[PDB]
Ligand binder design. Structure first.
Ligand code: SF4
Ligand SMILES: [Mg+2]
Ligand SMILES: [Mg+2]
Ligand SMILES: [Mg+2]
Ligand SMILES: [Mg+2]
Ligand SMILES: [Mg+2]
Ligand SMILES: [Mg+2]
Ligand SMILES: [Mg+2]
Ligand SMILES: [Mg+2]
Ligand SMILES: [Mg+2]
Ligand SMILES: [Mg+2]
Ligand SMILES: [Mg+2]
Ligand SMILES: [Mg+2]
Ligand SMILES: [Mg+2]
Ligand SMILES: [Mg+2]
Ligand SMILES: [Mg+2]
Ligand SMILES: [Mg+2]
Ligand SMILES: [Mg+2]
Ligand SMILES: [Mg+2]
Ligand SMILES: [Mg+2]
Ligand SMILES: [Mg+2]
Ligand SMILES: [Mg+2]
Ligand SMILES: [Mg+2]
Ligand SMILES: [Mg+2]
Ligand SMILES: [Mg+2]
Ligand SMILES: [Mg+2]
Ligand SMILES: [Mg+2]
Ligand SMILES: [Mg+2]
Ligand SMILES: [Mg+2]
Ligand SMILES: [Mg+2]
Ligand SMILES: [Mg+2]
Ligand SMILES: [Mg+2]
Ligand SMILES: [Mg+2]
Ligand SMILES: [Mg+2]
Ligand SMILES: [Mg+2]
Ligand SMILES: [Mg+2]
Ligand SMILES: [Mg+2]
Ligand SMILES: [Mg+2]
Ligand SMILES: [Mg+2]
Ligand SMILES: [Mg+2]
Ligand SMILES: [Mg+2]
Ligand SMILES: [Mg+2]
Ligand SMILES: [Mg+2]
Ligand SMILES: [Mg+2]
Ligand SMILES: [Mg+2]
Ligand SMILES: [Mg+2]
Ligand SMILES: [Mg+2]
Ligand SMILES: [Mg+2]
Ligand SMILES: [Mg+2]
Ligand SMILES: [Mg+2]
Ligand SMILES: [Mg+2]
Ligand SMILES: [Mg+2]
Ligand SMILES: [Mg+2]
Ligand SMILES: [Mg+2]
Ligand SMILES: [Mg+2]
Ligand SMILES: [Mg+2]
Ligand SMILES: [Mg+2]
Ligand SMILES: [Mg+2]
Ligand SMILES: [Mg+2]
Ligand SMILES: [Mg+2]
Ligand SMILES: [Mg+2]
Ligand SMILES: [Mg+2]
Ligand SMILES: [Mg+2]
Ligand SMILES: [Mg+2]
Ligand SMILES: [Mg+2]
Ligand SMILES: [Mg+2]
Ligand SMILES: [Mg+2]
Ligand SMILES: [Mg+2]
Ligand SMILES: [Mg+2]
Ligand SMILES: [Mg+2]
Ligand SMILES: [Mg+2]
Ligand SMILES: [Mg+2]
Ligand SMILES: [Mg+2]
Ligand SMILES: [Mg+2]
Ligand SMILES: [Mg+2]
Ligand SMILES: [Mg+2]
Ligand SMILES: [Mg+2]
Ligand SMILES: [Mg+2]
Ligand SMILES: [Mg+2]
Ligand SMILES: [Mg+2]
Ligand SMILES: [Mg+2]
Ligand SMILES: [Mg+2]
Ligand SMILES: [Mg+2]
Ligand SMILES: [Mg+2]
Ligand SMILES: [Mg+2]
Ligand SMILES: [Mg+2]
Ligand SMILES: [Mg+2]
Ligand SMILES: [Mg+2]
Ligand SMILES: [Mg+2]
Ligand SMILES: [Mg+2]
Ligand SMILES: [Mg+2]
Ligand SMILES: [Mg+2]
Ligand SMILES: [Mg+2]
Ligand SMILES: [Mg+2]
Ligand SMILES: [Mg+2]
Ligand SMILES: [Mg+2]
Ligand SMILES: [Mg+2]
Ligand SMILES: [Mg+2]
Ligand SMILES: [Mg+2]
Ligand SMILES: [Mg+2]
Ligand SMILES: [Mg+2]
Ligand SMILES: [Mg+2]
Ligand SMILES: [Mg+2]
Ligand SMILES: [Mg+2]
Ligand SMILES: [Mg+2]
Ligand SMILES: [Mg+2]
Ligand SMILES: [Mg+2]
Ligand SMILES: [Mg+2]
Ligand SMILES: [Mg+2]
Ligand SMILES: [Mg+2]
Ligand SMILES: [Mg+2]
Ligand SMILES: [Mg+2]
Ligand SMILES: [Mg+2]
Ligand SMILES: [Mg+2]
Lengths: 61, 208, 96, 82, 99
RNA sequence: UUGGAGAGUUUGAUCCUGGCUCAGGGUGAACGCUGGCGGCGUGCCUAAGACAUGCAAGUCGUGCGGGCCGCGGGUCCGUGGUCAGCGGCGGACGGGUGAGUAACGCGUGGGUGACCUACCCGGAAGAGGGGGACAACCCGGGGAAACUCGGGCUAAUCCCCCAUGUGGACCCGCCCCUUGGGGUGUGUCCAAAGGGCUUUGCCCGCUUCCGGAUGGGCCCGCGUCCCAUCAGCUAGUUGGUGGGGUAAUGGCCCACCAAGGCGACGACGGGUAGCCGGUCUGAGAGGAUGGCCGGCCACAGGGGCACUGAGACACGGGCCCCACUCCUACGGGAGGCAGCAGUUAGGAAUCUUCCGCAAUGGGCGCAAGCCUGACGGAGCGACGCCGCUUGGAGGAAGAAGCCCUUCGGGGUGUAAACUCCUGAACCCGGGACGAAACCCCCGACGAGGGGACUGACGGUACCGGGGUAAUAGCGCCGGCCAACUCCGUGCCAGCAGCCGCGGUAAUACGGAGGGCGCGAGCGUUACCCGGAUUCACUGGGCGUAAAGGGCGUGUAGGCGGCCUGGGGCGUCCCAUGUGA
RNA sequence: CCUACGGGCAGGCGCCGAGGGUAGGGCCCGUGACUGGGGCGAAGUCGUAACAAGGUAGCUGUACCGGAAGGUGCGGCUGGAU
């Protein structure tokens, strides 16, 4: 299937190993699942500050 | 753990003076007396009509913040009430009251409940003899809530006990002052305290 | 890689042997008897019939035949002998 | 045989036996034939042993055999004083 | 007790055996209404003495054959061929339910 | 009568219909960000895929005869041990798992005149005389091992025969009975084993029989999921006679005879599933569900089989076929973790190759005692619930920093600083309950009294004394829904559960300040119930919203007028058993 | 071979039997050159069939036809303006 990559900017390319979760994207028909950032070869959003667990981004100092 | 943070803002949001501080609460330095408007950048703005939801939230938070208690332990108690025989508010209020740490501050050994815990906690309190360092203890009719003998002789409790010689406290309670001992005689009728809170409203918040 | 569970097995072999042996014996004699009483030959069938009945019941004693089995084996035996002889007759021994 | 013994209830470091007449080969905390009294070895109560002595003797009559440590809590319950 | 049932013989066509059609009413667990269900029993008739129409009692009995676990207790009433015809037509009516 | 809340979205607006959506509770969970403590639970839901090493079932010298070593010390006899053997009883319990199974499998109530039951208990009787085998051992032949073949010796609670016959078994007759129940008469048939001490008597044993209890076997009524786009099924099929078989009924099996049995009350077929106690939810009715604990069932690499036995068609017993795997000396042979751990694979994902028999319980044993990955505990994992912490009192008309600002001030904020009080952690000493039985003493091995031994957890819990201010995180702030402002972006980047936000003034994107909610947790995804009276029994509907069959005729079925009477099936009442 | 000799054991034959093999059928899943429509997109092309008497009232069952919506016949319905 086809899955959405949430967040600003991603390190995904062909062969990237990925974890998915349920939940469509109302506006992209056929996208019915989401990629979990911060799991396997899909990394978190560099620089998120707000709502980070949802974008797999660790906590900054 | 429990709330443990800025504590004046609570009243300021809840609109009423909740006596969470013990002493300062009576000086005109009290947060409420200086600013009787809600915390933060927007307290000074012409507040908008609060929704029924709003209404009941605040009222519960109010009743909760009063005892500085975790939402769980709060909920359970409510639940313990909703099962239990009688009228829910009573029992909820009644049960809430029978919490040692509260019952410690009630018989006045402390100025804040928030301080009364630290006592209950650090072992400085006891019941019918044995020491009890668990603030959630459900104090029951008959109990003797002494101060730990090996704590009778302490500055912090000396002060607090003394301002209590001639204080009238609770139709449901007694106090051999100077001996530093008290009695839980009964759970309040609602009359017995008039906390600034329509607890019917709290039932309604949960029944949603 | 072992046990005296083996021991327990070794025995089963030998016990088995005893059983099977005593058990066939029955059949031979028992039926030899039914045989006679068919061609009866009355007296003999009764002679044999007993040497059956003893062996049947001597099985019954142990772990070979169960009791009711000996009983079962007996009832059917006698009925056959009798009713066979009863189509010629009559008994020169017992029982009965 | 049918037996008479301690089927543990309670919880970790909080023993609490039910003395039961169970089939020798039932599991220890298993289906029993009949409960006949309890027993608390930590002793933390007014009565930590009641023992339907009239029943315990029935089973005793009609065959049952108690454990070692169940015989005693029946001696202690006076089931043998004649 | 040994369960006893009351029903009509609908088939005599076996030797030393008859088919006894028991019925019952029982109110429907959810929808309330009293509803009917019936069942056939192969009933033991050592004397081949019961006939069609015969409304009889049968009793839970020691197993006679695979499927015969009842002996015919007692004649209760003769000649209700009006019943036999009930069942019989229902059966007949089935030829029409194929495809 | 302890129990019942709704909201968003079809329009310019309305009412109605109707779907989609959310807030609630839940879980053997998993994912993210973060993570201090303690207790009680709990933790391969996927591959019933594959498994290295260890461990999970044994014990009795008070059944017997020997080997090796030792203590007594005249080849010997004793005593102890130890090794196997012969003989016991156990190994069918306990532990595991859910593959199969829509079934008398399970649940519930019943039947058995159709039945069995080791060790236990109660009671009646009893144990006389012979005779024999086989291992161990000695002797030879085979191998790397697994081991093994042949020959001879010998004990016993091993085997067999005779005797005795309370008794019991069986044929026939008869009486009561009424499915094969009980009694009896004639015929017939069957018992046995000894061991140890204090040695004219106990005790553990052995035998036949009766009853109890206990665990079962079998049988019947009622209940038990989806598809009728599965409608017809059936030759051991359905019934009979006769046999065989079994503890016992039974086409369970066989021979013969008859032509029967089953199905819209859903046969047959296909799909899914172990069932219940319970669990989750719900006002209830309902819906969902069967992990943990308890009960029953089923399987033990896939299959078939029976042996021994009271009981198995036997997880760590046997045989054989298959599949895979290893071993080696290349000749041959060995395996069965759905036991406890553990490895690997698979997966989003589920743990220590721990500790001990102290308890409890089980096996053997007179007892001592041995075995016990059952079990009691410890280990790991915020997996769940519960309790505890990161402090408490004081402290400015209010610091710096940062945010807003109409440039006056507003905000974080008593928050901080700083003051004093307490004292999680750590240090120090003490240190359990769980353990009183078995045993020994006296009593009589009984009643009873008396003494003693024994703790994995654990030097832990907890008691006492000294003592340190000592982790905070996460979601969210357009409406539903509690929480608002600046900046950057400019139909981009992005957000998104639904309605919808972004086209240079965005409370809806991103950071910030501020705010709301929870707090060693917070959020996400998945699934279940709920909101959904949205399958409606409770508690909906069909003129136009989705929905009356094109119309007759009619089978089964559902339903049915006034009066009287019998029965009493539904219905109603009480009692009573069951509802672990 | 044992004797326990009217017997037992070996051993032999048979039934049945795991499965294996030969042959022929039933169902189900996966997949296939090519192919038929369907949903969606949309920022295109062609026309404008329906909603107004929608510019030929409309809808309809059927039959025949046409790039396409559609048209026409026969019958029916008003859920048709005047
Ligand atoms: S001071 Fe006034 S506001 Fe601040 S806590 Fe005491 S009472 Fe509440
Ligand atoms: Mg890569
Ligand atoms: Mg979703
Ligand atoms: Mg967001
Ligand atoms: Mg107040
Ligand atoms: Mg107050
Ligand atoms: Mg209001
Ligand atoms: Mg109430
Ligand atoms: Mg052995
Ligand atoms: Mg022969
Ligand atoms: Mg046998
Ligand atoms: Mg026998
Ligand atoms: Mg028959
Ligand atoms: Mg009510
Ligand atoms: Mg609601
Ligand atoms: Mg809209
Ligand atoms: Mg519309
Ligand atoms: Mg609109
Ligand atoms: Mg709606
Ligand atoms: Mg609710
Ligand atoms: Mg939820
Ligand atoms: Mg996590
Ligand atoms: Mg981590
Ligand atoms: Mg599994
Ligand atoms: Mg596989
Ligand atoms: Mg593999
Ligand atoms: Mg071991
Ligand atoms: Mg002995
Ligand atoms: Mg020894
Ligand atoms: Mg030995
Ligand atoms: Mg075994
Ligand atoms: Mg087992
Ligand atoms: Mg088991
Ligand atoms: Mg299963
Ligand atoms: Mg099926
Ligand atoms: Mg049934
Ligand atoms: Mg049943
Ligand atoms: Mg002898
Ligand atoms: Mg001899
Ligand atoms: Mg004799
Ligand atoms: Mg028969
Ligand atoms: Mg058997
Ligand atoms: Mg059959
Ligand atoms: Mg035949
Ligand atoms: Mg039926
Ligand atoms: Mg149907
Ligand atoms: Mg299947
Ligand atoms: Mg299954
Ligand atoms: Mg409801
Ligand atoms: Mg419903
Ligand atoms: Mg289920
Ligand atoms: Mg499950
Ligand atoms: Mg279970
Ligand atoms: Mg199998
Ligand atoms: Mg396997
Ligand atoms: Mg196998
Ligand atoms: Mg198998
Ligand atoms: Mg045995
Ligand atoms: Mg096997
Ligand atoms: Mg089995
Ligand atoms: Mg195994
Ligand atoms: Mg090997
Ligand atoms: Mg070689
Ligand atoms: Mg071989
Ligand atoms: Mg192995
Ligand atoms: Mg593992
Ligand atoms: Mg792995
Ligand atoms: Mg992997
Ligand atoms: Mg564990
Ligand atoms: Mg032990
Ligand atoms: Mg023990
Ligand atoms: Mg014993
Ligand atoms: Mg061992
Ligand atoms: Mg161990
Ligand atoms: Mg354990
Ligand atoms: Mg100021
Ligand atoms: Mg200020
Ligand atoms: Mg400032
Ligand atoms: Mg300022
Ligand atoms: Mg402070
Ligand atoms: Mg102790
Ligand atoms: Mg939130
Ligand atoms: Mg909310
Ligand atoms: Mg709001
Ligand atoms: Mg840009
Ligand atoms: Mg802007
Ligand atoms: Mg938002
Ligand atoms: Mg924003
Ligand atoms: Mg907590
Ligand atoms: Mg969560
Ligand atoms: Mg739902
Ligand atoms: Mg209705
Ligand atoms: Mg409706
Ligand atoms: Mg009509
Ligand atoms: Mg009509
Ligand atoms: Mg009619
Ligand atoms: Mg009628
Ligand atoms: Mg009528
Ligand atoms: Mg009438
Ligand atoms: Mg009636
Ligand atoms: Mg009842
Ligand atoms: Mg042979
Ligand atoms: Mg075949
Ligand atoms: Mg075949
Ligand atoms: Mg083969
Ligand atoms: Mg295609
Ligand atoms: Mg195509
Ligand atoms: Mg037109
Ligand atoms: Mg037009
Ligand atoms: Mg037109
Ligand atoms: Mg036309
Ligand atoms: Mg053209
Ligand atoms: Mg034309
Ligand atoms: Mg017409």
């Amino acid at each position: 299937v086809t899955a959405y990559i949430p967040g600003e900017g991603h390190n995904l390319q062909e062969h990237s190993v990925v974890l998915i979760r349920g939940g469509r994207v109302k506006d992209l028909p056929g996208v019915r699942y989401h990629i979990v950032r911060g799991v396997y070869d899909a990394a978190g959003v560099k620089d998120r500050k707000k709502s980070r667990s949802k974008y797999g981004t660790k906590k900054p100092k | 753990g429990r709330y443990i943070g800025p504590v004046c803002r609570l009243c300021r949001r809840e609109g009423v003076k909740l006596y969470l501080k013990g002493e300062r609460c009576y000086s005109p330095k009290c947060a409420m007396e200086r600013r009787p408007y809600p915390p933060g950048q927007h307290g000074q703005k012409r507040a908008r009509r609060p929704s029924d939801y709003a209404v009941r939230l605040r009222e519960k938070q109010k009743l909760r913040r009063i005892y500085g208690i975790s939402e769980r332990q709060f909920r359970n108690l409510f639940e313990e009430a909703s099962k239990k025989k009688g009228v829910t508010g009573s029992v909820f209020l009644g049960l809430l009251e029978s919490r040692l740490d509260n019952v410690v501050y009630r018989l006045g050994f402390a100025v804040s409940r928030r301080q009364a815990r630290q006592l209950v906690r650090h072992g400085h309190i006891t019941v019918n003899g044995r020491r009890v360092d668990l603030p959630s203890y459900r104090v029951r009719p008959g109990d003797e809530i002494a101060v730990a003998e090996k704590s009778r002789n302490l500055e912090l409790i000396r002060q607090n006990l003394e301002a209590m010689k001639g204080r009238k406290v609770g139709p449901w309670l007694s106090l051999d002052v100077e001996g530093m001992k008290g009695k839980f005689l009964r759970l309040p009728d609602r009359e017995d305290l008039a906390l600034p809170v329509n607890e019917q409203l709290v039932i309604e918040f949960y029944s949603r | 890689r072992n046990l005296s569970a083996l021991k327990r097995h070794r025995q089963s072999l030998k016990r088995r042997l005893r059983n099977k042996a005593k058990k066939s014996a029955i059949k031979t004699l028992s039926k030899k008897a039914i045989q006679l009483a068919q061609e009866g030959k009355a007296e003999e069938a009764l002679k044999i019939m007993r040497k059956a009945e003893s062996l049947i019941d001597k099985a019954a004693k142990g772990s070979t035949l169960h009791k009711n089995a000996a009983a079962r084996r007996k009832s059917r035996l006698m009925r056959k002998v009798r009713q066979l002889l009863e189509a010629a007759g009559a008994p020169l021994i017992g029982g009965g | 045989m049918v037996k008479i013994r301690l089927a543990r209830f309670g919880s970790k470091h909080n023993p609490h036996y039910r003395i039961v007449v169970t089939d020798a080969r039932r599991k220890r905390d298993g289906k029993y034939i009949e409960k006949i009294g309890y027993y608390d070895p930590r002793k933390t109560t007014p009565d930590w042993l009641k023992v339907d002595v009239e029943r315990a003797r029935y089973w005793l009559s009609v065959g049952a055999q108690p454990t070692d440590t169940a015989r005693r809590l029946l001696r202690q319950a006076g089931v043998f004083r004649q | 007790p040994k369960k006893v049932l009351t029903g009509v013989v609908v088939s005599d066509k076996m030797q030393k055996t008859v088919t006894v059609l028991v019925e019952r009413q029982f109110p429907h667990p959810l929808y309330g209404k009293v509803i009917k269900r019936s069942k056939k029993y192969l009933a033991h008739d050592p004397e081949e003495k019961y006939k069609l129409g015969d409304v009889v009692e049968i009793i839970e009995s020691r197993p006679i054959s695979k499927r015969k676990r009842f002996r015919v207790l007692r004649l209760v009433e003769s000649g209700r061929m009006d019943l036999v015809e009930k069942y019989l037509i229902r059966r007949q009516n089935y030829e029409s339910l194929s495809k």
